[PDB]
Design a protein around this nucleic acid. Structure first.
Ligand SMILES: Nc1ncnc2c1ncn2[C@@H]1O[C@H](COP(=O)(O)OP(=O)(O)O)[C@@H](O)[C@H]1O
Length: 964
RNA sequence: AAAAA
């Protein structure tokens, strides 16, 4: 249940600004200031019968911590919650000041001789927070996969995975913990890692209190109700849209000299400015940077979609120079101080050598490809303001204390792996946050380079959209299940029942039932149409529609259609059946060869790509974006609707998108698409539609294409049998048919909707993912990881202790003894298959000593995949076997034999940064494979694993962090 | 494509 709900207005005045324009962006005030206001919303979830006092009435007598500045309403409220011992979820933008709240919780815990845990999503963030907190409190420690420092500290900074582990082991630390702070909780919605947060939260004692720090989310109250329900305690939410440094949003149409303000500091969308920007749409990054360095709006960050891009843009800037030699002095000292902390052999590395020149010119690069030490030294140089321009990958925005005055996006679209799509509102929100250093800059500038006549409503949805929901991403894992079986007080079902996924599911039932009710009435508001005899007329037409589709499926099959798609052939295009491009003309076709992915499978209809000329293309469609032989048209590419101009274009399609084939062929220029050739085909297209006003002649499947299979003719006669049966109904000739059909069809639609919804609420009655739990239990029982009564076996106990790699395969390898006759260097090379994920250029064939153990483990892998398949788990057996990459087996092998980093870097195309990260994961995996051999009494194995650790842990691989 | 324990 909810209570104490209030919204509170806040208001300030800011220095007026013209930004990059010529007039004042906002109508100024008498004082010469600009007034901006923001909202602070509060609400609390209460357990049954709880004795609660309104939070605004609370007066804090003793402050556990004081601050130089005056607190914002959202901060004062959140701190009042903590002072009272009540959990709180703080939802605000990155710059707002959520650390102030977390700090107070820490101060309070330390004064009360209690312990407190601070969790973060990323190692990098952990280190930065440890460094920041240590300075302010002193009694601080750090727990991470890499480093452990002062574990007995009052305040522990650790990663969420590390906390998850502690809980399952039931450590004596939690017994003394009063508060647990979750920084960036919204990561709980991560498709792959999100479950870690949920799992961790559920496992916490009801005695502990929480501070959840999150970006602005629309469903914060849901999260709080869930906490309240599973931990039987109050949980507040403090939400605000407050933005410390006001933002200005600009569009930069490519290849132009214009720069347009489209969204001002009041989040007002400038309709006319946007119209001007789109009208001016028909090097640039260089122009823009120069303009920023000139107007003195640096430091600036330029986000690219790939590492490769960040480096190329960097080289195009080494012409410019932003630093005074007095700055180049302090800069280099910092750089060399850090570099000197590396082993002597590594201070000469190429990446280190080639990057310093840029740094001195004041140009930075930042992405996962860099050496860990280069990443942190560049982050530090940015803080001190020695770097005026930083070409960064999308991650930087996540990093704390790395804000910039100006932020530049090089494109309005992004490649998410599946589609080349528009940035979403949610994305863009988190994207705007990186601009504006709280104390230093009046305003923050955001610039987005655009190269397409985007529609207004699409632009609004992106530049002025809503924040994304915090939805559960819960799923089951074997390690998780085994641990829940093992631990005494709880079970796997317990986890399911307490998930936020299950919670959200339960909360939607009333929502769905309300909708059904609306539907039923709407369905009876039609009551009955005139005549039930229209039902027959509807069914007969439905069957015909279906049979006619089957006919189309045959006609368009390559075995029939291809012989009739000569250049110039008239075809009716309908891609996905939702985009009628009307009648186009075949340019050519070709069989589809997937070079990047061999084992990819094409349907017969997908197997051929047909190039087609259409003249119904929407005039503002991004035609420069569709690639050759790629049938997946980007969004924004659509047919023109009523009242829109059209153009000519060649688009790639499959045989599925051919609605019908015409009995005509117009002239197709052999001269490709060249300066006005296809526009003449559009002419011929226009003329043909005039020659045949009634309609375009369709090839007769039987009399022209000669399709006469016994089965196809049986089909073509089922249609006629109906086509007559229909034209003998009193309704075909009757009047008001187009009205009695519409009335009935709508009812039919309501009916279907109600049915499908009825299933939804039915399926939603049971606890979530029980079916999957059952199947995974089979796999575990079958492999002997536990008894049919779900009591954990030795295999299972081992598997629980394995977290850095596939727990099932690794446990099997260990028990089948696949490591017994392997030298340490061999063991390392094999395990790299469990520590490596990214794919790359196929590595040279493996020699016997490495290729053998590989094959012996792929056998065990297949044996497990088959079992996973038998259990009816959605898994591609072969793909699972390949899940474990071996592209670095020879790299790890040699490195364990003394080879230099510079030497192994020449064995692969994998970035230095990626190499180190995987070596560190391998160490982690090995450290786990040592704690295991302890709990198995395999002296032979423990020693071999300990030997692997020494071979790996050396040189640049074992180098420490700059911070700590 | 980019992040990531
Ligand atoms: N009420 C306030 N008035 C002025 N400055 C503040 C206030 N609250 C926080 N700050 C400052 O703003 C900066 C950003 O705060 P911080 O909490 O680090 O960001 P986050 O919201 O990501 O935790 C900090 O350096 C902090 O000192």
């Amino acid at each position: 249940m909810l209570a104490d709900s209030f919204e509170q207005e806040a208001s300030r005045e800011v220095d007026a600004s013209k930004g990059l324009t010529n007039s004042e962006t906002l109508q100024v005030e008498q004082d010469g200031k600009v007034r901006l206001s923001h909202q602070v919303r509060h609400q609390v979830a209460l357990p049954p019968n709880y004795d609660y006092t309104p939070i605004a009435e609370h007066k804090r007598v003793n402050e556990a911590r004081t601050y130089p500045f005056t607190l914002d309403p959202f901060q004062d409220t959140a701190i009042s919650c903590i002072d009272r011992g009540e959990s709180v979820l703080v939802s605000a933008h990155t710059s707002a000041g959520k650390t102030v709240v977390a700090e107070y919780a820490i101060a309070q815990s330390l004064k009360n001789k209690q312990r407190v845990i601070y969790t973060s999503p990323i190692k990098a963030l952990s280190n930065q927070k440890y460094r920041e907190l240590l300075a302010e409190f002193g009694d601080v420690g750090l727990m991470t996969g890499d480093i452990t420092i002062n574990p007995d500290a009052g305040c522990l900074v650790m990663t969420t995975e590390i906390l998850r582990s502690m809980l399952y082991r039931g450590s004596e630390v939690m017994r003394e913990v009063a508060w647990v702070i979750f920084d960036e909780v919204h990561y709980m919605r991560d498709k792959e890692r999100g479950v870690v947060w949920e799992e961790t939260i559920i496992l916490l004692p009801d005695k502990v209190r929480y501070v959840f720090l999150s970006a602005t989310i629309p469903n914060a109250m849901e999260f709080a109700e869930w906490i309240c329900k599973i931990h039987s305690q109050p949980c507040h939410i403090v939400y605000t849209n407050f933005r410390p440094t006001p933002l200005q949003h600009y569009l930069f149409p490519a290849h132009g000299d214009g720069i347009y303000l489209v969204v001002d500091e009041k989040s007002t969308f400038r309709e006319e400015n946007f119209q001007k920007a789109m009208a001016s749409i028909s090097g640039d990054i260089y122009k823009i940077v120069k303009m920023i360095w000139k107007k003195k709006y640096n430091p600036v960050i330029v986000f690219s979609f790939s590492k490769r891009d960040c480096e190329e843009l960097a080289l195009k800037m080494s012409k410019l120079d932003f630093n005074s030699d007095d700055e180049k002095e302090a800069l280099t000292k910092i750089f060399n101080n850090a570099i000197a902390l590396l082993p002597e052999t590594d201070r000469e590395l190429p990446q280190i050598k080639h990057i310093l020149p840029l740094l001195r010119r004041g140009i930075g690069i930042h992405h996962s490809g860099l050496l860990p030490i280069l990443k942190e030294v560049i982050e530090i140089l940015f803080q001190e303001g020695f770097l005026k321009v930083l070409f960064a990958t999308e991650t930087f925005s996540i990093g704390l204390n790395m804000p910039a005055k100006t932020v530049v996006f090089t494109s309005v679209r992004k490649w998410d792996g599946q589609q080349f799509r528009w940035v979403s509102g949610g994305e863009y929100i988190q994207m705007s946050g990186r601009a504006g250093r709280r104390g230093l800059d009046d305003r923050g500038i955001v610039i987005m380079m655009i190269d397409e006549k985007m529609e207004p409503q699409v632009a609004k949805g992106m530049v002025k959209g809503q924040a994304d929901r915090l939805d559960s991403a819960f799923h089951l894992g074997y390690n998780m299940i085994l641990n829940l079986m093992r631990v005494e007080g709880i079970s796997p079902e317990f986890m399911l029942e307490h998930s936020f996924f299950q919670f959200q599911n339960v909360i939607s039932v009333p929502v769905m039932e309300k909708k059904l009710a609306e539907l039923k009435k709407d369905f009876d508001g039609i009551e009955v149409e005139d005549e039930e005899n229209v039902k027959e007329y509807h069914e007969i037409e439905q069957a015909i529609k279906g049979y006619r589709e089957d006919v189309r499926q045959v006609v368009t099959h390559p075995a029939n259609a291809l012989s009739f798609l000569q250049p110039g052939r008239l075809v009716e295009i309908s891609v996905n059946g939702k985009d009628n491009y009307g009648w186009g003309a075949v340019v050519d076709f070709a069989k589809r060869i997937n070079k990047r992915n061999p084992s990819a499978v094409y349907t017969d209809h997908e197997s051929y790509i047909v190039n087609v000329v259409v003249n119904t293309m929407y005039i503002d469609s991004p035609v420069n974006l569709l690639k050759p032989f790629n049938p997946t048209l980007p969004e924004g590419i659509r047919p023109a609707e009523e009242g829109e101009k059209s153009i000519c274009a060649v688009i790639p399609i499959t045989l599925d998108s051919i609605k019908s084939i015409g009995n005509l062929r117009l002239y197709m220029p052999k001269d490709i698409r060249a300066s006005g050739q296809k526009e003449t085909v559009g002419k011929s297209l226009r003329e043909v539609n005039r020659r045949f006003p009634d309609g375009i002649p369709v090839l007769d499947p039987v009399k022209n294409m000669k399709i006469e299979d016994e089965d196809f003719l049986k089909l073509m006669k089922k249609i006629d049998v109906l086509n007559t049966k229909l034209s003998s109904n009193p309704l075909t000739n009757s009047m008001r048919l187009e009205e009695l059909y519409g009335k009935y069809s709508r009812k039919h639609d309501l009916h279907e909707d109600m049915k499908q919804l009825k299933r939804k609420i039915s399926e939603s009655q049971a606890v979530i993912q029980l079916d999957d739990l059952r199947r995974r239990k089979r796999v575990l029982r079958r492999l002997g990881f536990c008894t049919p009564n779900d009591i954990i076996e030795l295999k299972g106990r081992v598997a629980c202790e394995i977290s850095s790699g596939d727990e099932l395969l690794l446990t099997e390898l260990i028990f089948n003894g696949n490591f017994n006759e392997l030298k340490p260097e061999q063991a390392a090379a094999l395990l790299s298959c469990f520590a490596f994920q990214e794919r790359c250029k196929e590595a040279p064939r493996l020699k016997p000593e490495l290729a053998e153990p590989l094959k012996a483990m792929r056998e065990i892998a297949a044996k497990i995949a088959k079992i996973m398949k038998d259990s009816k788990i959605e898994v591609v057996e072969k793909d699972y076997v390949e899940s474990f990459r071996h592209e670095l087996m020879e790299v790890v092998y040699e490195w364990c034999r003394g080879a230099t980093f510079t030497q192994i870097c020449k064995m692969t195309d994998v970035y230095e940064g990626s190499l180190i990260r995987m070596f560190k994961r391998l160490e982690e995996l090995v450290k786990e494979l040592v704690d295991v051999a302890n709990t198995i009494g395999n002296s032979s194995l423990k020693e071999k694993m300990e030997a692997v650790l020494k071979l790996i842990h050396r040189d640049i691989v074992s180098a420490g962090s700059l911070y700590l």
